[PDB]
Design a binder for this molecule. Structure first.
Ligand SMILES: *[C@@H]1O[C@H](CO)[C@@H](O[C@@H]2O[C@H](CO)[C@@H](O)[C@H](O)[C@H]2NC(C)=O)[C@H](O)[C@H]1NC(C)=O
Ligand code: NAG
Ligand code: NAG
Ligand code: NAG
Length: 286
């Protein structure tokens, strides 16, 4: 029973290389000892339970043609550490239990799959997860608590989606988060307490969104921040700018520029060029 048809197998570590065959399905006869399974660059259309063996540590399925993953498919891959499903442009939705079983998973790639939404409980129990790549789908919203079990998540990539708002508990439970990329969305509001608990976050990209302002509490909630990108937003340099401006007076972080789009008499200037006296007619903190 030695190697799937058209693939190459290696014994240390136990590896099955099946890439670039235009397969329409996962090959049969995978040796049960297989630890690494390379199926990228095929045309596989669906996955089912009974397909993958329990020893896999690494599974690459990117650039296939996945449109369906049937319930139970990953359920017995207790040992799996990396799962790459990126670049399956017709995949479109995932059932709530897709990743049930995957408690040792450390990185999960789901970029460019045309996801518009996710089930609110799809990432529950992924306690080992460290990297989660969701960039360049079409995600419209992220529910409160969508990442709540991910106490080890270090990088979360959410750029290039269609997000408009970050709600109060969207990032609840992300106490290890180090980098959060949100650029290239259409974000218009961030809840005051959206970054609560992100005490280890050092990098935050928000550039290229529709932000006119950000609350003071959100920046205050990032005590470890080191690099913040804010450019290519329509920043309002009026009373709304003051909590951000005040945070900039005290913060030690690298930053992009923060260019005012309004009012016209300040358009083009950097938000940090404003003076305390530009804010003297502003109602006191509310
Ligand atoms: C990639 O999978 C997609 C999505 O299932 C396939 O597009 C479909 O093609 C079939 C037959 O041509 C039609 O029933 C559908 O109208 C198409 N669906 C969608 C959503 O476009 C496409 O056939 C697949 N291509 C390959 C090369 O596997
Ligand atoms: C990733 C994302 O949301 N971007 C979309 C994409 O369809 C397009 O290619 C680009 C225009 O150049 O901006 C918009
Ligand atoms: C697979 O399919 C495409 C036809 O779309 C072809 O160009 C390519 O050479 C095929 N690749 C392999 C590796 O057999
Ligand atoms: C900004 O984001 C959109 C995705 O929302 C993208 O199409 C475009 O390439 C980016 N624009 C700039 C000016 O970088």
């Amino acid at each position: 029973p030695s190697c799937p048809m058209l693939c190459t197998c290696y014994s240390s570590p136990p590896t099955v290389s099946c890439q670039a065959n235009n397969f329409s399905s996962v090959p049969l006869s995978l040796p049960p000892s297989t630890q690494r399974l390379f199926l990228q660059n095929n045309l596989i259309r669906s996955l089912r339970p009974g397909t993958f063996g329990p020893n896999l540590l690494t599974l690459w399925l990117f650039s296939n043609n996945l449109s369906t993953i049937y319930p139970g498919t990953f359920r017995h891959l207790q040992a799996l550490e990396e799962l790459d499903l990126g670049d399956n442009r017709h995949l479109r939705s995932l059932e709530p239990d897709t990743f049930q079983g995957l408690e040792r998973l450390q990185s999960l790639h789901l970029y460019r799959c045309q996801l518009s939404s996710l089930p609110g409980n799809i990432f529950r129990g992924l306690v080992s997860l460290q990297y989660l790549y969701l960039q360049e789908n079409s995600l419209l919203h992220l529910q409160d608590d969508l990442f709540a079990d991910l106490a080890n998540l270090s990088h979360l990539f959410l750029h290039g989606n269609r997000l408009r708002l970050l709600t109060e508990h969207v990032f609840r439970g992300l106490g290890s988060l180090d980098r959060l990329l949100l650029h290239g969305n259409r974000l218009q509001g961030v809840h005051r307490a959206a970054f609560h608990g992100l005490s280890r976050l050092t990098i935050l990209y928000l550039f290229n969104n529709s932000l006119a302002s950000l609350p003071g509490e959100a920046l205050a909630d990032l005590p470890a921040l080191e690099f913040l990108r804010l450019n290519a937003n329509p920043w309002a340099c009026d009373c709304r700018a003051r909590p951000l401006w005040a945070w900039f007076q005290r913060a030690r972080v690298s930053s992009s520029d923060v260019t005012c789009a309004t009012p016209p008499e300040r358009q083009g200037r950097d938000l940090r060029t404003l003076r305390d006296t530009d804010f003297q007619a502003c109602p006191p903190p509310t």
